[PDB]
Structure formats: C-alpha cells, structure tokens
DNA sequence: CTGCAGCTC
DNA sequence: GAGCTGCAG
C-alpha cells in the first residue's frame, strides 16, 4: 500500500468498510473489530444477535446464555494496554467472550469468562462511570475460563 | 476492486491501510482514522502543537494560545441528525471546539470553530457516561459566533 | 491508575 | 432521551 496516496489510503479505509457491510460481515460505521467479533461468536454459538444499542449483552445463545462480546486487536502480545477491554457499565449478562485478533484480523485467542470472574477482575473508573477488565494471560488461563480459540477459528 | 476480494483479504486490507497511514504519520493510533486525521488537518491549518494523545480536555494549542478540542464525524447522510452527534465531552477546559465533518470519501465537507461557551449552551448531559453531548447541527454551525473553517481545512488536505 | 476516539436506536 | 464499539499514557 506504500504506492497509494494518502487520499487513496483514506478512500480504501472507507470502501473496505462499505464492502464489509455490504457482505453483512459488519453492520455499523465503527471500525470492524467489534461487529466482526460479534459475528464470529454468533456463528460459533448459533446465537441471536441483539439490537445494536441494547444494554448489557450482545448475543443470546440457543441454550439461553447472554453473551457480552469484547474484542481487541493485538499488535504486540507483550503490550498490556492492548489487553484493555471496552468499559462495562452493566453486569446483567451470563458470560463475556473475549476475542483477541492479530494484526491481520485473524483470531489469535478467544475465551469465555463467567460474569462473576469478570467482576472479580474488574476495576472501577469514576471518570467514565464503568468497569475496566484486562484480558491478561492470567484471566485467559483462569481455571473457570473456557478456551474458545479453536471454536472461533472454525467459523472464520 | 474490493468486491472481488475474499472476506479474509478485505479484513487484512482494513488492517494494512491503517498500518500504512500510521507509518506515514497521518494517524498515530489504532483507532479508526477519522479522529487522528481530523487532528492532523487542524494542526496543518493552525500550525499548532499537538497535545499528548491521552491529554484531557483539548487536542491542539494554537500559536496564539487557543486550546482546541477537535471533534470529527464522517457524514454519509447530510440530513441525518444522529450523524452530527459529537464524541462525549467530560471536561470544558478548552477555548474552542473545531468540528470537522468528513464525507464518506474522507474529504472535508464542513468545518467550524465553536467557542466553548457556545458548545456548553448546546450540550445535554448524559448521566450514563458522565459526559456532555453536543450535536453539530446546522443551527450550531451557522451560529453568529462560529467561524467557518471549511476552506482552511480544505486547503491542507491532499 | 489516569485518560482517548475499540484504543446507534 | 436511551444507548454502543467515533484504543493510549
Ligand atoms: Ca460488546
Ligand atoms: Ca478530540
């Protein structure tokens, strides 16, 4: 992409978003990671996608589980800051599904974390009125956490 | 043509374009490019100093000392009220906001310098996020105390 | 920990 | 109004 002008680079950024939405891979104007991670969890659970602005959770599974999906793109597996999950303002869900992409947007690691374990790992931020969880290796490897890496790779 | 690419190739191109924009200094973060790119245009237009990326309240200090809070949206529908909603404001310690409205090809469509006091008048509080919401509606853009910066920003995009 | 733009109805 | 994901020091 080094041969493209900056104007073309910005246009490719928008056009790729537009084509992804046309294919139903994403459904919003956000950067694709959030919607794409939800799509994969939906495929893996055969679940029901919630309304985009619904509070608390994103996907309801066939067995009735309410899943809060949280994704990050990892460019440096040793950068703790890239493990910071998007803020949590409501605990009315059954489990979080953490989806860690590599910088080619391939699934690197995924984990199903019970809500109670998420709460135990959370720190409150008064600035944003919400809770921060870090998807550090210790949480991903927690004895009550399920490794979902292969389950999400099989739906990529 | 992107319609000929596999979904895997599309996603990789999404990352690759972000990486190339950061390598060139057009952006300086892994966010979607709009936020950093709007700050870059305002910096080019004011010859100002970029604040630290995690700095509270403002983004750019002008040579004359104005602390500018840059707020951008990419407009796909010029008549859509929701697309004027600016990112939340949790601190009023800035002198003026610079609103940058892009079109869906990432060209500058409209830009405006809004005094902080006018931003405060238009804001509604959201207890859910502990912040203030301002909409870049035409009435705000056309306010008598708002400066049109569209041509300034257009002269520095490439 | 402190913050920012994951890092629409 | 109610909400979401406009990632960094
Ligand atoms: Ca989510
Ligand atoms: Ca800003």
Numbering used by the authors:
A (entry chain B): 13 to 168
B (entry chain A): 12 to 169
Q: What does the article say, verbatim?
A:
The BisI family of restriction endonucleases is unique in requiring multiple methylated or hydroxymethylated cytosine residues within a short recognition sequence (GCNGC), and in cleaving directly within this sequence, rather than at a distance. We present the crystal structures of NhoI and Eco15I_Ntd (N-terminal catalytic domain of Eco15I) in the absence of DNA and in specific complexes with fully methylated GCNGC containing dsDNA. Both proteins are homodimeric, with each domain involved in target sequence recognition and catalysis. The crystal structures show that the modified cytosine bases are recognized in the context of double-stranded DNA, without base flipping.
As the crystals of the specific NhoI DNA complex diffracted far better than other crystals, the following structural description focuses largely on this complex. The DNA in the NhoI–DNA complex is bound in both orientations that are compatible with the 2-fold symmetry of the enzyme. This does not compromise the electron density for the base pairs that follow the two-fold symmetry, i.e. of the external and internal G:5mC pairs. However, it somewhat blurs the density for the central symmetry breaking base pair, and for the flanking base pairs that do not follow the 2-fold symmetry. The external 5mC, and the paired guanine, do not form a single direct hydrogen bond with the protein. Instead, there are only water mediated hydrogen bonds from the proximal subunit on the major groove side (Thr144, Ser137), and from the distal subunit to the minor groove side (Asn42, Ser65). Recognition of the internal 5mC is more stringent, with a purine selecting hydrogen bond from the Ser98 (partially conserved) to the N7 of the paired guanine, and a G:C or G:5mC pair selecting hydrogen bond in the central minor groove from the guanine to Asn42. In NhoI, the pocket for an external methyl group (GCNG5mC) is formed by the proximal enzyme subunit, namely by the Cβ of Ser98 and the side chain of Arg84, with the side chain of Gln96 only slightly further apart. For both NhoI and Eco15I, these are a histidine and a valine of the distal subunit (His139 and Val140 in NhoI). In NhoI, a guanidino group of an arginine residue nearby (Arg101 of the proximal NhoI subunit) also contributes to the internal methyl binding pocket.
